[PDB]
Write a protein that binds this DNA or RNA. Sequence first.
DNA 1: CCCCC
Lengths: 457, 457, 171
Amino acid sequence: GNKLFNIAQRILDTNSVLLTERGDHIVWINNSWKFNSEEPLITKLILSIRHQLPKEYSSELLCPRKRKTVEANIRDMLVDSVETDTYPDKLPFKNGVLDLVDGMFYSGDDAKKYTCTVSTGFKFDDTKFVEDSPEMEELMNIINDIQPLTDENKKNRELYEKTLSSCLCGATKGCLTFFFGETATGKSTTKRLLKSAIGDLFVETGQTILTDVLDKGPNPFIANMHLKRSVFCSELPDFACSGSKKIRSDNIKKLTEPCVIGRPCFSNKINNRNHATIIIDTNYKPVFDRIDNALMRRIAVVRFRTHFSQPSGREAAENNDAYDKVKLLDEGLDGKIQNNRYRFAFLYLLVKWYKKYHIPIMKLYPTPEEIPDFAFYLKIGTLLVSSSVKHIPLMTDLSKKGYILYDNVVTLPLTTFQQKISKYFNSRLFGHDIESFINRHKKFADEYLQYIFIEDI
Amino acid sequence: GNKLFNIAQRILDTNSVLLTERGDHIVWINNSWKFNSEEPLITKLILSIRHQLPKEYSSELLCPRKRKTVEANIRDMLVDSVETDTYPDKLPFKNGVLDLVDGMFYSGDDAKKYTCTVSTGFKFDDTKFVEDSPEMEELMNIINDIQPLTDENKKNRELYEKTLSSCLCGATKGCLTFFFGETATGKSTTKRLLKSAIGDLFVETGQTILTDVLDKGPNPFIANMHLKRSVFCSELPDFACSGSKKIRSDNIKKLTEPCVIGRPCFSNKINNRNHATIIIDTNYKPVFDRIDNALMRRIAVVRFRTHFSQPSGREAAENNDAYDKVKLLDEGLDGKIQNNRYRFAFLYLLVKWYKKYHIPIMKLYPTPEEIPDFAFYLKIGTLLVSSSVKHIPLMTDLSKKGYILYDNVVTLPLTTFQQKISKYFNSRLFGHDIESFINRHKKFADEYLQYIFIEDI
Amino acid sequence: VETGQTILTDVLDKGPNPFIANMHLKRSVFCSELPDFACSGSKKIRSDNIKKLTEPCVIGRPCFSNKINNRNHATIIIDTNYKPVFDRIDNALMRRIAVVRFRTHFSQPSGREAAENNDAYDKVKLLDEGLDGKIQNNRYRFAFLYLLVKWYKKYHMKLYPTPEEIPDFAF
DNA sequence: CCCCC
Ligand SMILES: Nc1ncnc2c1ncn2[C@@H]1O[C@H](COP(=O)(O)OP(=O)(O)NP(=O)(O)O)[C@@H](O)[C@H]1O
Ligand SMILES: Nc1ncnc2c1ncn2[C@@H]1O[C@H](COP(=O)(O)OP(=O)(O)NP(=O)(O)O)[C@@H](O)[C@H]1O
Ligand SMILES: [Mg+2]
Ligand SMILES: [Mg+2]
């Protein structure tokens, strides 16, 4: 009774082909879920699975025509969709899934339950996923060189560890991180170590995702981040020189959301799932077009302060205040990392840090005090208090301080506000910021401002 | 004779395949109407419906080639189009349709009468659609935190509810709503809750639909809005720092019409039905290039004024006038909502609000007062009116007031008009607006304005 | 179909524009709610578009199309309250214009006395509220069609210029 | 379609 339909029915009963909500067909081959939009892999699954069927059914699947017929039947059978990539604490490899909470490695049907449609791209080797090894010792020395274990670097080192370990989580993070340092401090070394450790879950993009409009037309540079767990942007075009495009704060806000809008070439899929830790490597501090409390909530900075130099340039490097430590450059490290020598040692370190910093919830917090741009605003937040009903009685002496009440609200005229605020910031140094604050928060009635200096109280 | 033609005739008689006005082919599979432009579903329907046909006819449908022949017959037989999505009070699910007027869930042929070709994408559960539940108390607490039940917030809160309930109606709305507030006020929480509640009827788009030419070319960002009952745009590139493209009033007007123009890749359907409540998440009020009563009549604003902060930054949050209340941030809420914990509780709340605000006709009303960009024009309503032929005798005092009789109609000079305007408002903060108004109302005979102030009478 | 005032102040070729393209075989077009020209500082009425739009063909790219020529059958009527002052006055606009005069006043009883004294309004009547309700019912559909057919038969055909009807065409 | 413009 239509042998080929029966074969398709059995293959469907195995649950090895699924239809996803984006319209892709994912197949379970070699202990991983795979898909290829440009070329479906269903006939590959049919050929591979021919060994699990009766003897008479297997001999039909050696003809490509019959495999195509079975594929047509399977495509007509799949009507409903499924959801994929819903477990944030599972690390998919090419031959199984690693449980980050437990540490157990699963294969076969154990790994199949988590419909992880992405993977590192390499096989998990449990012989190399060990704590004691010469590779581990070399990597420990390298890491302690890049981020020393001193008391002045404790917070910075902890933030470094937490940011690197968050690249294993399949969830949406609320902060973008800047690896900030001078030249030859180990930022690219860390980037390449992470890329080696996490394989295909890592991606590099261009700066257009920070300075251009994401929707526009086709944009693979934003559609390629779909389901990635780490996104790297490098070589910030510093903006001290005139004409440089600033970073769009709305781009930051859009990149911090669970879904990002953008499509590739020849595609109608306009929304991409955002699971990525976004890191920007820079020698210069960022400059944004507009500054507000929404942006100051999504920025963290890690600093690199160890210089690796040739013997000729060491002495001068010792007289630079951008460095706290000067070491000798090792010319064989780049090739060693390019060969994936520290892949599993760094993976073990990342898993250990994930355990360490995953008190029930792992959350990335901002560091607004590390950005000079924000400085002014922070200082303002420590100087002024919004006028409230509790300040009405204080008017008794507020008049002696220059305060004039109006509509039951304490206010200070523009001239008085300028006189009082010139005592905290240099007019030339903080001209644009002070003017912007005045314009943004100035009232009218002759201009008024609803703020009281904490010192007067 | 011609068994396959007879099978196609029977399938056509079942009424499970229809041709829409745009030319879509909609099929009825698994208790829902479905269409996939770039992936026809007629052969899936043939395979699924083979069971209703006689015994001899069903065995022929196991061959993909025979199914393709039957599909060719069926689509040659379909000459007349039908009307779809004409009931705005039916909510379609993956297994039936819910009546919003009464609250009865239909399945099978009962749901088939309403040709609802879109659905939430998930199955309606009767057990979880309950008024009392542990999740309902948490949802009520969250919603009350975001929009407190206080007199000062009464009216605003209602608008909130109304807008949210309007996401259930399958009709065209005449307003665009702006969710306005400072950072960490619950706007994105509300958006995620609504997305969870209404599934696939919710869509997210880019800001291009607000600041670009809708015609252009193949536009998936507009083609994806077809038959959607909720469209969200986020992160307006505000204009505090001037230099960004403004919102086009032409797009605002095109987005309130029953039909929109936009076509996907590899498809020819430039016509999309507009059922969507359009909501914009912003930290800054909008600014448009042109202001006119046509644009001023389709804008509404909802305020968010509750701050959720960590204990470290709470005290400062208590001295900001942008917040009426400060709460404690919960780090588990995001993951709870992302896992669809409050899907059915929020659906029940939305249905209750729909019943409450759907007295015979539900309508969305603009709130032009909130927008400051519209402020000056509004003052013109109380500033001056257009003189009629009834202001002849008044000129007896008009000469005393400054106006000079001319053409038997009250009129004012340019300098006199400027002097009179100076009384209502100061040109220091509105001088450019005064100049624009003078140019707009300029009349030349040596230019005079035939406008009468209300106070003048 | 009705058209706005954008066409009278914008170029045709430009980029993606559906308004001009949808004119294909469309049998009428009215520019309504005109941007009164008395507003100094606003762009004046362009005459190049007036001359071009009357051509037997229409040049312009329909959205998501690849043809820049379309049939032009629409009858062009521009309805406004203010006099037209062309941006540039030449022989083309002088010989390619006309004017229709309306002097019927629909005024409410409250404002009838004030409205009647207006010189512009010659006959003043009481506004009929239900007429709009009768318009949407399409009750005057066949009657209007019959009247239009009668007028077309009686008048048949062309449109003569009215240089005197426009003040700016005086000098 | 994208590119191109
Ligand atoms: N212990 C060490 N750890 C890391 N890198 C080391 C170490 N010893 C030597 N190096 C090398 O010193 C150089 C450090 O610069 P590298 O990390 O490549 O770039 P960067 O300083 O991050 N970026 P840039 O400023 O643009 O040059 C590389 O050649 C490293 O391989
Ligand atoms: N009761 C509560 N109601 C709403 N959000 C809450 C509540 N308790 C904690 N939160 C959290 O507080 C945070 C507020 O952020 P969010 O909901 O995105 O606000 P927002 O106003 O959209 N922020 P922003 O884009 O910066 O202006 C989120 O982590 C919420 O989950
Ligand atoms: Mg480098
Ligand atoms: Mg938000």
